[PDB]
Design a protein around this ligand. Structure first.
Ligand SMILES: N[C@@H](Cc1c[nH]c[nH+]1)C(=O)O
Ligand SMILES: [Mg+2]
Ligand code: NI
Length: 493
């Protein structure tokens, strides 16, 4: 690989390179686009396209002041027009934006002058500044387009550090440095995002020198020991793994069953042995957040509590020593993405724990994208954001976000809890920080009393990189390790 070219592998690919359809599962949107705000090495809110902002006392009015030295990749200037268009596009239900929920509380967007936009809200939404980091859209290209289907989505123009060059689908996306980047000089002139979902192949291509960097599963990490072409950077993350219950399932809809299944698992055993202390035991989805109550009940590893719960639910043990109810065995499937060894291994351990308490389960391992995980009995799932606590909680747990009911929802297990709904809505619409913490405490407590998941472990990630690489900075990563390329414009060899 030439010195003026950077090649990075990422596991997840997106169909539309457009902030409006961002699902925190990609690395290319933050390359092409830039938002009004951004985050530094410490996850602190920093100015990006917006040079500064003022927020009204009641949190309903945002005055945003824009930089005037920003160009779109087509040489067209960034202005307040783009901001009004972008935000109005996110809000428009006809665009089916994946980030619609972050913009739904917006009343109006006013252009006061070409560098000053005034945003008014129906209700407070303190995550708004975090939400505005997502990336602005070019008005002059998309004004007369169908955002859902526009060819723009496969030929994007943004204000980010990198320009779109060409896209080989299922292969790679190539970028070139934005010569007019306002924030900083983009160091490496060529950037290739290579799509590799198989970690063994990712490891092999590193050894081959076909790619410069990738996130490598901990089980494969020992392979790069003694290798001198590579350094290893350990990164913390808000990413957790869990078992998603499908509450449509005849057995998993029952509360007593889900509580019993939580009692059956020795998460410390899992973390210690399977993850080699590259993790810690998870109990709820906000344990890296300020919203963490650090004062919550847990389901502690206790098989007889588990078995006793199942009897209470009305299950009788049979001659095989497996629970049955009204003539039918307590049986369901555990699906895992076969391309993710950690998930397959976790599903395998879960199956073994469940049998020891007389629950029959079947592990189904299929490649990511080959099946609909919102229709399987249970699924080894993952989520987690280092940003506002609302971002991977509302779409994931709130009942209106049921994916069967909402095409842009992330509630794949069809979970419906009234207390979760109220707590998340009030938390996302409350300005006071301490009051927010109280509502997220309610949320966590509500999750305990009616578990949608079996929370398992928060993950650390390992970045394996060409040792010739300069300028890499670590920070708290999100789900799938998204964000490890956050400062890639500083990268050079
Ligand atoms: N984010 C969820 C769903 C998903 C499927 N593929 C990628 N993500 C998970 O990681 O389990
Ligand atoms: Mg950005
Ligand atoms: Ni995911």
């Amino acid at each position: 690989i030439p010195k003026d070219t950077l090649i990075i592998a990422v596991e997840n690919e997106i169909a539309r390179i457009n902030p409006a359809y961002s699902e925190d599962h990609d690395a290319v949107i933050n390359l092409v686009f830039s938002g009004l705000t951004r985050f530094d090495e410490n996850m602190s809110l920093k100015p990006d396209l917006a040079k500064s902002w003022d927020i009204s006392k009641d949190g309903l009015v945002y005055d945003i002041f824009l930089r005037d030295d920003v160009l779109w990749h087509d040489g067209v200037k960034f202005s307040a027009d783009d901001v009004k268009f972008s935000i109005e596009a996110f809000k428009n239900p006809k665009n089916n934006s994946s980030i619609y929920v972050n913009f739904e509380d917006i009343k109006s967007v006013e252009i006061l002058n070409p560098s000053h936009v005034k945003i008014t809200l129906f209700k407070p939404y303190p995550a708004f500044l975090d939400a505005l980091s997502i990336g602005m859209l070019p008005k002059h290209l998309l004004e007369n387009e169908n955002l859902n289907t526009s060819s723009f989505n496969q030929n994007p123009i943004g204000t980010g550090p990198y320009k779109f060059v060409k896209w080989k689908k299922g292969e790679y996306v190539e970028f070139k440095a934005n010569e007019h980047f306002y924030l900083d000089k983009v160091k490496t002139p060529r950037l290739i995002i290579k799509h590799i979902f198989d970690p063994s192949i990712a490891s092999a291509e590193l050894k081959n020198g076909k790619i410069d960097a990738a996130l490598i599963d901990v089980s494969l990490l020992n392979i790069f020991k003694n290798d001198e072409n590579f350094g290893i950077l350990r990164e913390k993350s808000a990413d957790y793994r869990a078992l998603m219950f499908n509450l449509d399932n005849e057995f998993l809809k029952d509360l007593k069953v889900r509580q019993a299944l939580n009692y059956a698992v020795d998460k410390e055993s899992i973390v210690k042995n399977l993850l080699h202390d590259y993790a810690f035991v998870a109990n709820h989805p906000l344990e890296r957040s300020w919203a963490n109550s650090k004062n919550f009940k847990i389901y502690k590893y206790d098989p007889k509590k588990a078995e006793d719960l199942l009897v209470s639910a009305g299950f009788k043990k049979n001659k095989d020593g497996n629970f049955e109810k009204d003539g039918k065995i307590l049986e369901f499937e555990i699906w895992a993405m076969s391309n993710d060894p950690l998930r397959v291994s976790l599903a395998g351990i879960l199956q073994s724990e469940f049998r020891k308490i007389g629950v029959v389960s079947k592990v189904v391992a299929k490649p990511a994208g080959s099946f609909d995980y919102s229709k399987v009995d249970s699924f080894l799932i993952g989520w987690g954001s280092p940003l506002d606590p609302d971002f991977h909680t509302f779409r994931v747990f709130e009942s209106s976000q049921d994916s069967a009911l909402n095409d842009e929802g992330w509630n794949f297990g069809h979970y419906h809890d009234k207390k979760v709904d109220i707590a998340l809505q009030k938390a996302r619409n409350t300005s006071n920080l301490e009051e927010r913490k109280k509502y997220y405490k309610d949320f966590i407590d509500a999750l305990y009393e009616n578990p949608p998941f079996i929370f398992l472990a928060y993950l650390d990630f390992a970045l394996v990189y060409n040792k010739d690489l300069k300028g890499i900075k670590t920070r708290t990563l999100g789900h799938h390790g998204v964000g490890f390329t956050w400062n890639v414009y500083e990268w050079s060899k």
